[PDB]
Amino acid sequence: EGPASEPDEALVDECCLLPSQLLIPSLDWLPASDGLVSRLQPKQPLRLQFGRAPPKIDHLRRLHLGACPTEECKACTRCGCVTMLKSPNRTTAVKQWEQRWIKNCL
Amino acid sequence: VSVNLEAFSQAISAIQALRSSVSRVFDCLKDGMRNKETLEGREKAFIAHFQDNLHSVNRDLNELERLSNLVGKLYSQLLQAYKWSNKLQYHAGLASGLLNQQSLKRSANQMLVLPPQYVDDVISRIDRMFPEMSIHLSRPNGTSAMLLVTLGKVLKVIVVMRSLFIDRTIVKGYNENVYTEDGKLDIWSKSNYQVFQKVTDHATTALLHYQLPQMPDVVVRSFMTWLRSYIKLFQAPCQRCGKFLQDGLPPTWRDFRTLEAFHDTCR
Ligand SMILES: [Zn+2]
Ligand SMILES: [Zn+2]
């Protein structure tokens, strides 16, 4: 209960036996700062324009797409994750994992 | 032998091209999709590229076996000192250059005696091959050498030199008395044939064409090489008009630097 304990090096060398068999497949870091949180500054405004916009895998479901995919998404504006619109499976689909973010992301 | 050692090159490249092309077949189908605006410009291109790469693999496989059909079939320390002499032959070709004969000559204006045995040594150098032709050197008149040449069963040619340079050349057939009644070589006469008199003009134009101010040996060598094409007379049709006879005349005129029988009208 509240350990604040650094795991021992005996675990570290056993985790160094991991690349003997297992290598890291991939990750998905959510906080892509597409919003203006990492673009503006007080007394330093940016005179924006419209439409200038100064490896593509779905953030919600784990279905890999192509380089320039085709399927459409609803814009989860709060964090930029691709809340993709039309799920591939509907006749056999989970009815809450899709419906929890049927509106927006958390 | 090197015919198999160079015919193996196409196959040893083709198998690696098969590996690369099947890798392309794998990853392009594995690349997913690149729409590039319209879908009809992509999904109709999907079957196009899927036919393209698979058919490239197929044609590579196919051209593999026609190459496979035609083909057939101190320990290492002193080996290193062997092939360097063989690459010295390439080193001889390193300093050759393609500039060759062509130069950038301007006007030659500012601001001799040689023995006839040298002429004999000149004529002995090229008579040693082409056994179908013969050379008979003679000087019954002065030190100038005029030569009798027989060409198989076809031509008898008198070739007069003077001052080690060219004087004259007259060609006749095979069944005429090229000598006179006295037995000396004839000097001033005519070939008494329309084709022969027509091609003597071509010979006169050719002798004024090969122009070396210092080196007449290559002039007369190119002249006799040009004459060597004339043992194919009455046997090869013309290269542009198809038929032999242009107004009853078979092709004779060999072009400069491109030896093939033509006419004056046929150029
Ligand atoms: Zn989100
Ligand atoms: Zn012709």
Short mmCIF file of C-alpha atoms and ligand atoms in Angstrom, two decimals:
data_model
loop_
_atom_site.label_atom_id
_atom_site.label_comp_id
_atom_site.label_asym_id
_atom_site.label_seq_id
_atom_site.Cartn_x
_atom_site.Cartn_y
_atom_site.Cartn_z
CA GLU A 1 0.00 0.00 0.00
CA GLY A 2 1.96 2.95 -1.36
CA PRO A 3 5.22 1.08 -1.93
CA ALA A 4 7.40 3.64 -3.78
CA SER A 5 9.72 0.68 -4.37
CA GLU A 6 12.16 0.42 -7.26
CA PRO A 7 12.06 -3.21 -8.51
CA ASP A 8 15.29 -5.09 -7.89
CA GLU A 9 17.96 -5.77 -10.51
CA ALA A 10 17.16 -9.50 -10.31
CA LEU A 11 13.95 -8.57 -12.11
CA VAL A 12 16.00 -6.37 -14.47
CA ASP A 13 18.30 -9.16 -15.68
CA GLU A 14 15.30 -11.48 -16.09
CA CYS A 15 13.69 -8.72 -18.17
CA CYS A 16 16.94 -8.66 -20.15
CA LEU A 17 16.16 -12.29 -21.04
CA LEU A 18 13.01 -10.96 -22.74
CA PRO A 19 14.76 -9.92 -26.03
CA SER A 20 16.10 -13.48 -26.27
CA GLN A 21 12.51 -14.43 -27.16
CA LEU A 22 10.14 -11.43 -27.19
CA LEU A 23 10.61 -8.12 -29.00
CA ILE A 24 8.39 -5.04 -28.73
CA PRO A 25 5.67 -5.14 -31.44
CA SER A 26 4.43 -1.52 -31.35
CA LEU A 27 2.83 1.14 -29.17
CA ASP A 28 0.16 3.85 -29.52
CA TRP A 29 0.83 7.10 -27.69
CA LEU A 30 -2.48 8.95 -27.53
CA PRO A 31 -1.44 12.59 -26.73
CA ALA A 32 -0.86 13.85 -30.26
CA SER A 33 -1.17 17.60 -29.66
CA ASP A 34 -3.28 18.50 -32.67
CA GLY A 35 -5.00 21.17 -30.59
CA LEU A 36 -3.65 24.64 -29.89
CA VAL A 37 -2.21 23.65 -26.48
CA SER A 38 1.32 23.33 -27.92
CA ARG A 39 1.07 25.99 -30.64
CA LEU A 40 0.24 29.36 -29.04
CA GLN A 41 1.71 31.69 -26.42
CA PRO A 42 0.59 34.88 -24.64
CA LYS A 43 1.87 37.97 -26.51
CA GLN A 44 2.81 35.56 -29.36
CA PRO A 45 -0.35 34.94 -31.40
CA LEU A 46 -0.44 32.89 -34.59
CA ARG A 47 -2.48 34.39 -37.44
CA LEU A 48 -4.05 31.15 -38.64
CA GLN A 49 -5.63 30.35 -42.00
CA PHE A 50 -8.15 27.76 -43.15
CA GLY A 51 -7.05 24.42 -44.53
CA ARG A 52 -3.27 24.88 -44.53
CA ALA A 53 -2.56 22.47 -41.60
CA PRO A 54 1.00 23.57 -40.64
CA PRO A 55 1.58 3.96 -39.77
CA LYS A 56 -2.08 5.05 -39.68
CA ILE A 57 -3.66 2.67 -37.15
CA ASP A 58 -7.01 3.09 -35.40
CA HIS A 59 -6.58 4.39 -31.86
CA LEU A 60 -9.66 2.56 -30.54
CA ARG A 61 -9.77 -0.79 -32.36
CA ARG A 62 -6.67 -2.84 -33.20
CA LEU A 63 -7.25 -3.30 -36.92
CA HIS A 64 -4.27 -2.25 -39.03
CA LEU A 65 -4.94 -0.09 -42.09
CA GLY A 66 -2.87 0.95 -45.08
CA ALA A 67 -0.64 3.95 -45.68
CA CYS A 68 -3.57 6.14 -46.79
CA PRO A 69 -6.74 4.43 -45.49
CA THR A 70 -10.28 4.81 -46.82
CA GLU A 71 -12.66 4.29 -43.87
CA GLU A 72 -14.20 7.43 -42.36
CA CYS A 73 -14.08 8.58 -38.74
CA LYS A 74 -15.87 10.96 -36.41
CA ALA A 75 -13.53 13.69 -35.17
CA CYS A 76 -12.80 13.12 -31.49
CA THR A 77 -11.74 16.74 -31.06
CA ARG A 78 -10.73 16.48 -27.38
CA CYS A 79 -7.59 14.39 -27.99
CA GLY A 80 -7.49 13.61 -31.71
CA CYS A 81 -7.90 9.84 -31.53
CA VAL A 82 -9.59 8.41 -34.60
CA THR A 83 -13.04 7.42 -33.36
CA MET A 84 -13.72 5.53 -36.57
CA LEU A 85 -17.33 5.62 -37.70
CA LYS A 86 -18.58 2.40 -39.31
CA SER A 87 -17.34 -0.64 -37.40
CA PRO A 88 -16.29 -3.65 -39.54
CA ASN A 89 -18.49 -6.13 -37.63
CA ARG A 90 -22.07 -5.24 -36.71
CA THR A 91 -24.10 -8.48 -36.68
CA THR A 92 -21.63 -9.86 -34.08
CA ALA A 93 -20.51 -6.77 -32.17
CA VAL A 94 -20.00 -5.75 -28.56
CA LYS A 95 -22.79 -3.32 -27.66
CA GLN A 96 -21.09 -1.26 -24.94
CA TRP A 97 -17.40 -0.94 -25.89
CA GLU A 98 -18.58 0.84 -29.06
CA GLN A 99 -21.53 2.58 -27.39
CA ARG A 100 -19.50 4.03 -24.50
CA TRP A 101 -17.69 6.29 -26.98
CA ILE A 102 -20.48 6.37 -29.53
CA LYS A 103 -20.61 10.11 -28.70
CA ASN A 104 -17.11 11.31 -27.77
CA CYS A 105 -13.85 10.16 -26.17
CA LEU A 106 -12.89 10.43 -22.49
CA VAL B 1 35.03 -21.59 -72.02
CA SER B 2 33.03 -18.39 -71.46
CA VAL B 3 29.71 -18.90 -73.29
CA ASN B 4 28.21 -20.66 -70.25
CA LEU B 5 30.02 -18.33 -67.83
CA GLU B 6 28.23 -15.36 -69.43
CA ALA B 7 24.94 -17.15 -70.11
CA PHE B 8 24.77 -17.92 -66.37
CA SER B 9 24.65 -14.16 -65.69
CA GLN B 10 21.05 -13.78 -66.88
CA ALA B 11 19.87 -16.69 -64.71
CA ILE B 12 21.82 -15.60 -61.61
CA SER B 13 20.29 -12.13 -62.02
CA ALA B 14 16.84 -13.58 -62.77
CA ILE B 15 16.62 -15.59 -59.55
CA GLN B 16 17.46 -12.52 -57.45
CA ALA B 17 14.96 -10.55 -59.53
CA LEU B 18 12.43 -13.28 -58.67
CA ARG B 19 13.20 -12.83 -54.97
CA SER B 20 12.88 -9.04 -55.26
CA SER B 21 9.69 -9.26 -57.35
CA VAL B 22 7.98 -11.70 -54.99
CA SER B 23 9.01 -9.38 -52.15
CA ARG B 24 7.28 -6.58 -54.08
CA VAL B 25 4.21 -8.81 -54.53
CA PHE B 26 4.18 -9.40 -50.77
CA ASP B 27 4.65 -5.82 -49.56
CA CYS B 28 2.55 -3.97 -52.17
CA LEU B 29 -0.42 -6.18 -51.29
CA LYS B 30 0.68 -5.68 -47.66
CA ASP B 31 0.88 -1.89 -48.11
CA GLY B 32 -2.91 -1.62 -47.74
CA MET B 33 -4.30 1.31 -49.72
CA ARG B 34 -3.26 4.73 -51.04
CA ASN B 35 -6.47 6.31 -52.32
CA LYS B 36 -5.06 9.48 -53.97
CA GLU B 37 -8.40 11.32 -54.10
CA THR B 38 -10.91 9.32 -56.14
CA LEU B 39 -11.61 5.67 -55.36
CA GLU B 40 -12.15 4.68 -59.01
CA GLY B 41 -8.59 5.86 -59.62
CA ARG B 42 -7.50 3.47 -56.85
CA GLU B 43 -9.76 0.40 -56.77
CA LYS B 44 -9.57 -0.05 -60.54
CA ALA B 45 -5.81 0.47 -60.20
CA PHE B 46 -5.83 -2.22 -57.49
CA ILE B 47 -6.51 -5.01 -59.98
CA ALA B 48 -4.14 -3.30 -62.44
CA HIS B 49 -1.16 -3.36 -60.08
CA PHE B 50 -2.15 -6.79 -58.70
CA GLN B 51 -2.04 -8.11 -62.25
CA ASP B 52 1.16 -6.13 -62.90
CA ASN B 53 3.35 -7.47 -60.09
CA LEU B 54 2.03 -11.04 -60.27
CA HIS B 55 2.54 -11.08 -64.05
CA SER B 56 6.03 -9.64 -63.54
CA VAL B 57 6.77 -12.57 -61.21
CA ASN B 58 5.24 -14.92 -63.79
CA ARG B 59 7.26 -13.57 -66.73
CA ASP B 60 10.44 -13.65 -64.63
CA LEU B 61 9.70 -17.31 -63.81
CA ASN B 62 9.00 -17.96 -67.49
CA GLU B 63 12.16 -16.36 -68.86
CA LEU B 64 14.13 -18.30 -66.23
CA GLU B 65 13.67 -21.66 -67.97
CA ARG B 66 14.49 -20.50 -71.51
CA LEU B 67 17.82 -19.30 -70.10
CA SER B 68 18.16 -22.56 -68.15
CA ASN B 69 17.58 -24.56 -71.35
CA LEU B 70 20.35 -22.89 -73.38
CA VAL B 71 23.03 -23.21 -70.68
CA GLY B 72 25.18 -26.29 -70.19
CA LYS B 73 27.82 -27.70 -67.86
CA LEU B 74 50.59 -21.77 -52.10
CA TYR B 75 47.06 -23.16 -52.28
CA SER B 76 45.65 -19.65 -52.83
CA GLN B 77 48.70 -17.42 -52.26
CA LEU B 78 50.47 -17.60 -55.64
CA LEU B 79 47.08 -17.25 -57.36
CA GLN B 80 47.21 -13.51 -56.58
CA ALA B 81 50.24 -12.87 -58.82
CA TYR B 82 48.59 -14.42 -61.90
CA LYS B 83 45.57 -12.29 -62.84
CA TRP B 84 47.40 -8.96 -62.44
CA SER B 85 49.13 -9.56 -65.78
CA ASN B 86 45.69 -10.24 -67.26
CA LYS B 87 44.33 -6.97 -65.85
CA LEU B 88 47.39 -5.24 -67.28
CA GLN B 89 45.70 -5.93 -70.63
CA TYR B 90 42.80 -3.80 -69.38
CA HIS B 91 45.42 -1.29 -68.20
CA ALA B 92 46.56 -1.19 -71.84
CA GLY B 93 42.98 -0.28 -72.72
CA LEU B 94 42.87 2.33 -69.96
CA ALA B 95 44.97 4.87 -71.89
CA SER B 96 43.48 4.18 -75.33
CA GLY B 97 40.78 6.85 -75.55
CA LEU B 98 38.04 7.22 -78.15
CA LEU B 99 39.58 10.26 -79.88
CA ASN B 100 41.28 7.83 -82.33
CA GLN B 101 41.78 9.05 -85.91
CA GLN B 102 39.74 12.26 -85.75
CA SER B 103 41.64 15.50 -85.14
CA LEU B 104 41.10 19.28 -85.44
CA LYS B 105 43.48 20.12 -88.27
CA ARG B 106 43.82 23.64 -89.67
CA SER B 107 45.62 24.76 -92.82
CA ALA B 108 49.06 23.14 -93.04
CA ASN B 109 50.88 26.18 -94.45
CA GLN B 110 53.49 27.88 -92.29
CA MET B 111 53.10 31.45 -90.96
CA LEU B 112 62.16 11.84 -99.22
CA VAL B 113 63.93 9.10 -101.17
CA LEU B 114 63.03 5.52 -100.21
CA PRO B 115 64.30 2.26 -101.72
CA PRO B 116 62.04 -0.01 -103.81
CA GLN B 117 62.86 -2.85 -101.41
CA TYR B 118 60.87 -0.88 -98.83
CA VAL B 119 57.96 -0.98 -101.30
CA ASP B 120 58.47 -4.75 -101.56
CA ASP B 121 58.41 -5.04 -97.75
CA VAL B 122 55.22 -2.97 -97.79
CA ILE B 123 53.57 -5.28 -100.33
CA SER B 124 54.73 -8.41 -98.49
CA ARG B 125 52.88 -7.39 -95.32
CA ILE B 126 49.33 -7.57 -96.70
CA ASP B 127 49.75 -10.21 -99.43
CA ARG B 128 50.37 -12.85 -96.75
CA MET B 129 46.65 -13.26 -96.05
CA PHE B 130 43.64 -13.33 -98.44
CA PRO B 131 44.87 -16.38 -100.40
CA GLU B 132 42.11 -16.04 -103.02
CA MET B 133 43.95 -13.00 -104.44
CA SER B 134 47.51 -12.94 -105.74
CA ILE B 135 50.15 -10.22 -106.13
CA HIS B 136 52.86 -10.24 -108.82
CA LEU B 137 55.27 -7.32 -108.40
CA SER B 138 57.27 -6.22 -111.42
CA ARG B 139 59.37 -3.27 -112.58
CA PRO B 140 60.04 -3.70 -116.33
CA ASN B 141 60.03 0.10 -116.71
CA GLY B 142 62.13 2.05 -114.21
CA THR B 143 62.07 1.62 -110.46
CA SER B 144 58.29 2.13 -110.35
CA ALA B 145 56.44 -1.08 -109.50
CA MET B 146 53.30 -2.18 -111.32
CA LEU B 147 51.55 -5.29 -110.08
CA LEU B 148 49.41 -8.04 -111.57
CA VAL B 149 46.54 -9.20 -109.35
CA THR B 150 44.32 -12.20 -110.00
CA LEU B 151 41.09 -12.56 -108.01
CA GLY B 152 40.12 -16.23 -107.92
CA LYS B 153 38.42 -16.84 -111.27
CA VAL B 154 36.98 -13.35 -111.66
CA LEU B 155 39.29 -10.36 -112.14
CA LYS B 156 42.72 -9.43 -113.48
CA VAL B 157 43.94 -6.04 -112.25
CA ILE B 158 47.01 -3.98 -113.16
CA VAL B 159 48.03 -1.68 -110.30
CA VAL B 160 50.71 0.89 -111.16
CA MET B 161 52.66 2.73 -108.45
CA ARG B 162 55.09 5.60 -108.86
CA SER B 163 57.47 7.32 -106.41
CA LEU B 164 56.18 4.91 -103.70
CA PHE B 165 52.71 6.49 -104.17
CA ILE B 166 49.73 5.47 -106.29
CA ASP B 167 49.84 5.97 -110.06
CA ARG B 168 46.94 4.07 -111.65
CA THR B 169 44.77 0.95 -111.46
CA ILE B 170 42.86 -0.77 -114.29
CA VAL B 171 40.60 -3.80 -113.80
CA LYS B 172 39.59 -6.37 -116.43
CA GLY B 173 37.94 -9.79 -116.29
CA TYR B 174 39.51 -13.24 -116.21
CA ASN B 175 39.72 -14.35 -119.87
CA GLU B 176 41.70 -11.57 -121.56
CA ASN B 177 45.33 -10.99 -122.50
CA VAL B 178 46.37 -8.39 -119.93
CA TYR B 179 49.88 -8.54 -121.40
CA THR B 180 50.81 -7.09 -124.77
CA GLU B 181 52.04 -9.03 -127.80
CA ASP B 182 55.61 -8.42 -126.62
CA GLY B 183 54.64 -9.82 -123.20
CA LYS B 184 55.03 -6.62 -121.17
CA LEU B 185 52.19 -5.42 -118.96
CA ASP B 186 49.70 -3.22 -120.79
CA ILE B 187 49.84 0.42 -119.71
CA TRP B 188 47.28 2.44 -121.69
CA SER B 189 44.16 0.54 -122.76
CA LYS B 190 40.49 0.13 -121.84
CA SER B 191 38.59 -2.65 -120.11
CA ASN B 192 36.14 -2.97 -123.06
CA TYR B 193 33.19 -3.52 -120.71
CA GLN B 194 30.44 -1.11 -119.65
CA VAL B 195 30.37 -2.23 -116.01
CA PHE B 196 34.17 -2.28 -115.72
CA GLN B 197 34.55 1.16 -117.32
CA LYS B 198 31.77 2.42 -115.05
CA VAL B 199 33.49 1.16 -111.89
CA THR B 200 36.93 2.42 -112.92
CA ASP B 201 35.47 5.90 -112.38
CA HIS B 202 34.45 4.81 -108.88
CA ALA B 203 38.01 3.56 -108.34
CA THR B 204 39.40 6.93 -109.44
CA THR B 205 37.05 8.72 -107.04
CA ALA B 206 38.07 6.31 -104.27
CA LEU B 207 41.81 6.89 -104.75
CA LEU B 208 41.26 10.64 -104.39
CA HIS B 209 39.06 9.91 -101.35
CA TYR B 210 41.59 8.10 -99.13
CA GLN B 211 43.79 11.14 -98.40
CA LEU B 212 46.73 10.68 -96.05
CA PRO B 213 49.46 13.33 -96.57
CA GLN B 214 52.19 11.17 -95.00
CA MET B 215 50.93 7.58 -94.76
CA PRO B 216 50.01 6.09 -98.15
CA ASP B 217 50.31 2.51 -96.86
CA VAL B 218 46.96 2.75 -95.10
CA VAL B 219 45.61 4.45 -98.25
CA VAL B 220 46.48 1.48 -100.45
CA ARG B 221 45.47 -0.99 -97.71
CA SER B 222 42.03 0.61 -97.46
CA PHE B 223 41.93 0.62 -101.27
CA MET B 224 42.56 -3.12 -101.52
CA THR B 225 40.16 -3.76 -98.62
CA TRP B 226 37.56 -1.83 -100.63
CA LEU B 227 38.49 -3.93 -103.68
CA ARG B 228 38.03 -7.10 -101.61
CA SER B 229 34.30 -6.34 -101.47
CA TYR B 230 34.27 -6.53 -105.29
CA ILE B 231 34.75 -10.29 -105.31
CA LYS B 232 31.06 -10.38 -104.32
CA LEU B 233 30.08 -8.69 -107.59
CA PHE B 234 27.18 -10.15 -109.61
CA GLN B 235 26.13 -11.98 -106.42
CA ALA B 236 24.53 -9.43 -104.04
CA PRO B 237 21.39 -7.39 -104.82
CA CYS B 238 21.07 -3.69 -104.14
CA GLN B 239 20.25 -2.51 -100.64
CA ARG B 240 17.55 0.04 -101.51
CA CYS B 241 15.99 -0.89 -104.86
CA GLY B 242 15.81 -4.63 -104.13
CA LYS B 243 16.53 -5.77 -107.67
CA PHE B 244 20.04 -6.14 -109.06
CA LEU B 245 19.59 -4.27 -112.33
CA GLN B 246 19.16 -0.50 -112.26
CA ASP B 247 18.73 0.19 -115.99
CA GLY B 248 20.42 -3.17 -116.53
CA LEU B 249 23.24 -2.42 -114.08
CA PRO B 250 23.85 -4.53 -110.94
CA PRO B 251 24.86 -2.67 -107.75
CA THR B 252 28.57 -1.93 -107.61
CA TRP B 253 29.19 1.36 -105.77
CA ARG B 254 30.41 0.65 -102.25
CA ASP B 255 29.87 3.73 -100.10
CA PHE B 256 32.71 5.39 -98.22
CA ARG B 257 33.13 3.93 -94.68
CA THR B 258 30.09 1.66 -95.32
CA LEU B 259 30.92 -1.08 -97.84
CA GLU B 260 27.74 -2.24 -99.58
CA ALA B 261 26.94 -2.43 -103.28
CA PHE B 262 24.95 0.47 -104.73
CA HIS B 263 24.53 2.43 -107.96
CA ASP B 264 25.09 6.09 -108.79
CA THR B 265 21.33 6.64 -108.62
CA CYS B 266 21.24 4.36 -105.57
CA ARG B 267 23.99 6.51 -103.97
ZN ZN C 1 -10.24 10.76 -27.94
ZN ZN C 2 20.21 -0.30 -106.75
#
